[PDB]
RNA sequence: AAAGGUUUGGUCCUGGCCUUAUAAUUAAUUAGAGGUAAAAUUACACAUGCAAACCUCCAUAGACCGGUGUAAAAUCCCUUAAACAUU
């Protein structure tokens, strides 16, 4: 298609089959389809653990730096990948979500202890 | 429903050296005296899927299926050699020897397994080392100087940790979103609480 | 006929008329009027050397002149005047072959 | 997806916004993380923008670029 | 500071080029400072609604 | 039998044997040769054998040939700067003419090698995609990675059909 | 300090090339691979000798010895420890820089562990991922099963040592532990069974003699070189042994007596030979055969 | 080519439409009018967000 | 194409047709489960529901994604200039 307006973006293009996802990191005009016309492929992401239990991300850091220097935006999933790698700082919501998970597990542990204490009362009753 | 039982099941390689094998086959391959029955002069590009269905055998059993004592095993290298080109070392396609597609797949796996364990020889090309230079002094493969925060034990950036908001700022947000508020949360646990089990 | 002669590896194409007698007479005519490497070395007086791609640059001498070895190199033209067959050349020019070509067939 | 000339759904005439509820302590901490995060990323995007322009200028008018041009003429 | 991986790539390049130093790479934030989100925007370049009534 | 004389001239291998790749300045090469004579034999062979090879490697250069217009054969190159390079090819073999033009107006081997490497800069082995552009279409092809569900059925716990059933069960 | 000789030292490469030998028939033995119809050229004796010269030039490049290196040191560097991300992920992430123009040993391959530690990838992890993104013909992503001791012993029974080593070079890196393990196991089997001829006119002979010299077990190779009438090779081996062990009693004895030629081998027998009695016997028998017949 | 032909109606339409826009430009008193009972703009029928009520 | 069948009382030559290989759709008869891919008579007419919102008012978006193969020898490849409803 002949797009009018839009910007270059670095995003994940979904590949693979059903229940077997595989991603291609690409630089593409934002208005193009998710799996359609792109400008350059900048790496790949395999989200499924392999035989060694490792999720494999490949980043062409020389081309990624080139396209960020030319105005390319980043999708939120790609910003999360760059933060985990260490090339970018950790995303604010990566930290906030980790804090929410910590507060949510603390409640669960406390509830189990309360249930165990309630179970202890049942043991006292015999 | 009674397929014959081979005496050489445990040691398949034995059959190919026994006198019975020599009389039946001599020194020619086991597919030498097999011919496929088909209409036309150009044959179909695939052989029959399988010669044996539920203990029944087809009209013209293929070289492997016709002889029950023949066993396709990675250890039976002498049988496997007959299905590999001596000059090019390429496994023959199924139409070449006339074996059924089931046994051709089984033969291909046995030949590949025999080669991997070294029982069956194949040509190993000579390839140069991967890297022109074998130095290991670059930072990628060496020790990077530890960052100041890492030595002290602090977070890489100050905002990675929870910094309690000023009390005046918490009141400013309670006024802005008055009537649609949630219970205020304190500092999060220092570590990840161990999963309850 | 090739099995009767003992030839094990060869390619052939027959075109024009498929007359069985003319094919047998023409086949024997050509096969009997070929030139062995030993004959070629004697006619030209030079060594006949063989270069296989599976043996690398190793030169293989297959026939040496019976009498006196010459010292004048055989003339190598810049561009040969050979008469080429379109059927042989067409393949190397990238032209698609027929669906009937190089089909999987039983061992001969 | 609908075009601007398509009619609105009738099941959705009632819709009104229901803004999320705000936790004061975590909302403020998150707002500061976004401000500091976006400052770091703008400093890195600027540094990446300079490497692109430095590399381009070296190719266009670098030492090696000028010598080859005259070498060909000579 | 620089991000953890990007800091290691800078220090590694220093050693390769022969630059020997223990200086810590530092990002400069003065050139790229963000305005508050509620800062007044440029009204001159803002769009105006069309004149077709709904 | 391929028609014409020297049918090898009409083969892709022969056309690719040409070694004269002109510099970007070269725009036109006019060839003035005589069909009869003795001192112009090399020029006639140059038109017969070499002009096809030159054009094959220089598709954008205009080669126009004129016959029996002058007493002697010559080659004149027209450059983009406006310079005109006259060459005298009388009493010169066709091979000698090719070597002469290669020296004065032919790109060097180093220049041609650099261009070939630059052309392939954007092909990466790691890149995944169609066979025309990439070695592997999917990471399932790689050894050790989770195989394609079509070839190998996935474990039940890794399937949305199974996971959705549990969520209903919960 | 007098520098310890290296594998690539121009002097060592000279001696190792000589003892290895050349044989155009063994170096260019026909490969069992897809074949093409041979080509034929009529050549004079001058042209034929020129063609043999180019064949020997190619046999030199073909016999180039593979590097002999020390075992690499484990990569144990922690770039960061972001504990905020502890417990938020179950599987490790492996990030590989796939910029085309970086040498593979200068690429950054990091691992973000579930604890949050950002560390550099180990050597085994580095080689696996570089195969996935820069695949090398001959190498497999996961270690093959042919290199297991039981499988390797089978290849040795079939006298396929040159293949075991050609496979070890396509798969493993020269400084890896697996590379050193397989090579040292192949070289050790050749010694015990006296199969030194298998690797002659091959690129693997130099490393084998190097391994014996450094491990002070050249005795078998001298006995076998002498019995094959290659006594110029045996002397050169004693020169290499007197070069890598200058302070050895044998090297000091040869300086005292200014021994040369067959004398050098006799000096080794008396001074440092593990089995000196046999070296003299084989050396003596060789001299008797040479003197008696000629 | 030369079988691609002018589109007079298309050219006429574009100009004519643009002219009407300039002639019948609305004013701020109409575009930004509000119905305070429903908090909806009569011009476009755009109901203001909840946090602004 | 590695070819074969078929003109005649018979032979040779010429020459067409057809067979043998591969794949898609529909149809006849017949059929267990599982995984995966694809889903397609018709630019003829369409009941019903849904497919574009967001948001402290202004703006932004609904110009995309998705669909079909209408028109048209319609194009490919390349050069030059210019903007951009952009970043
Ligand atoms: S093609 Fe890769 S998962 Fe199916
Ligand atoms: K016919
Ligand atoms: Mg606003
Ligand atoms: Mg007739
Ligand atoms: Mg049907
Ligand atoms: Mg589309
Ligand atoms: Mg139409
Ligand atoms: Zn069968």
Numbering used by the authors:
A (entry chain M): 10 to 135
B (entry chain O): 42 to 238
C (entry chain D): 325 to 432
D (entry chain U): 27 to 100
E (entry chain 0): 165 to 218
F (entry chain T): 2 to 171
G (entry chain R): 63 to 356
H (entry chain 0): 3 to 55
Sentences reproduced from the published study:
In this study, we determined sequential cryo-electron microscopy (cryo-EM) structures of stable assembly intermediates and initiation complexes at 2.8–3.2 Å resolution that involve six factors: RBFA, TFB1M, METTL15, mtIF3, mS37 and mtIF2.
As several rRNA methyltransferases are required for the assembly, to stall the process, we first depleted the enzyme TRMT2B, responsible for the formation of 5-methyluridine16,17, which produced a viable cell line with stable rRNA and allowed to purify intermediate pre-SSU particles in different states.
